[PDB]
Amino acid sequence: VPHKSSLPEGIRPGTVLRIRGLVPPNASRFHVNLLCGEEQGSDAALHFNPRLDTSEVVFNSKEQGSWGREERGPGVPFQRGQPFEVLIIASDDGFKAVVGDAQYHHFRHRLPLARVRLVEVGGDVQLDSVRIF
Amino acid sequence: MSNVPHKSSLPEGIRPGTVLRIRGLVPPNASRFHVNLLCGEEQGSDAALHFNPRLDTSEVVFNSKEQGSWGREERGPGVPFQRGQPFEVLIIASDDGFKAVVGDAQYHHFRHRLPLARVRLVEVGGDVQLDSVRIF
């Protein structure tokens, strides 16, 4: 079952999302989604998708039911059997993804930051905590 | 010789979305310590933010300094620092001010008095053992 953090006021430049958890021993992939509503199939301002089985981290957006063009970060800073800490930092121009205290990828906004209403974490991850500062 | 404040430069300044992470330890007999967001490298430069945990009065004072004059102090609730204990502080810049997070809890919101665009260095001084300043 996915974890959901409701943000009915939305988020602004200066919003910090900290996601901690464990990648379990046989994990295929997991995701952190910044969604614009609570309906299934809602728009995704950010889809952050570490894929352990393919050794890729995919970034994408979803807009009226259709996915955009994927972006990929450099390699995969996640491992089966290892805990992680991800920061997703909203600024005026995009999201900064920090993994293991290292700046990892910058994802330019494709949807207005103001439309975000929900953070959802799902897939093969054993969640420690999601915090929004 | 000891107690020289630690400085970290901000070569391109800071913006909404800048995250300052300050990790340290409060010495067993600390009086007070501070984190300053300063607008220049000279003594007496303006402080966009002065974050001043005071253990001997059990309070946390927030303020700004402009033209060598301190502004109106604000205080957070109580004091989430303890002598002899490690701490982690987040200072997060937004459009409307700085959010101070202490011990993983939102602690105070200090609305901007000086422009974020003028902040050019982080200074940590007082009775504190500084482990790391990281800028995200």
Residue numbers in the entry:
A (entry chain A): 4 to 136
B (entry chain B): 1 to 136
Article sentences:
Galectins (Gals) are a family of animal lectins that bind β-galactose-containing glycoconjugates, and their carbohydrate recognition domain (CRD) has a conservative amino acid sequence. To date, 16 mammalian galectins have been discovered, and galectin-7 (Gal-7; also termed p53-induced gene 1 product), belonging to prototype galectins, is a multifunctional effector by productive pairing with distinct glycoconjugates and protein counter-receptors in the cytoplasm and nucleus, as well as on the cell surface. Gal-7 participates in diverse processes, such as controlling apoptosis, cell migration and cell adhesion. Gal-7 was crystallized in complex with glycerol under two different conditions.
The two refined structures, structure 1 (homodimeric Gal-7 binds two glycerol molecules) and structure 2 (homodimeric Gal-7 binds three glycerol molecules), were crystallized using two different conditions, one at a relatively low concentration of PEG3350 (12%) and the other at a higher concentration (20%). Homodimeric Gal-7 binds three glycerol molecules at its two carbohydrate recognition binding sites (GOL A and GOL B) and the new binding pocket formed by its N-terminal and loop connecting strands S2 and F1 (GOL C), respectively. Monomer A of structure 2 can bind two glycerols. Its N-terminal (Asn 3-Val 4) and loop connecting strands S2 and F1(Val 124-Leu 130) form a GOL C-binding pocket. GOL C can form hydrogen bonds with Val 4 and Gly 126, respectively. In addition, GOL C interacts indirectly with Val 128 and Leu 130 through a water molecule in the new ligand binding pocket of Gal-7. This means that the N-terminal of Gal-7 interacts with loop connecting strands S2 and F1 via a hydrogen bond bridge formed between GOL C and a molecule of water. Discrepancies between structure 1 and structure 2 in monomer A are due to the absence or presence of GOL C. B-factors of structure 1 suggests that the N-terminal regions are very flexible, while the N-terminal region of structure 2 is relatively stable due to the binding of GOL C. Glycerol binds the pocket near the N-terminus of Gal-7, which can greatly reduce the flexibility and improve the stability of this region. It is noted that glycerol binds to GOL C sites of monomer A but not monomer B in structure 2. In addition, we found the GOL C pocket, which binds glycerol in structure 2 of Gal-7, is deep and negatively charged with surrounding amino acids.
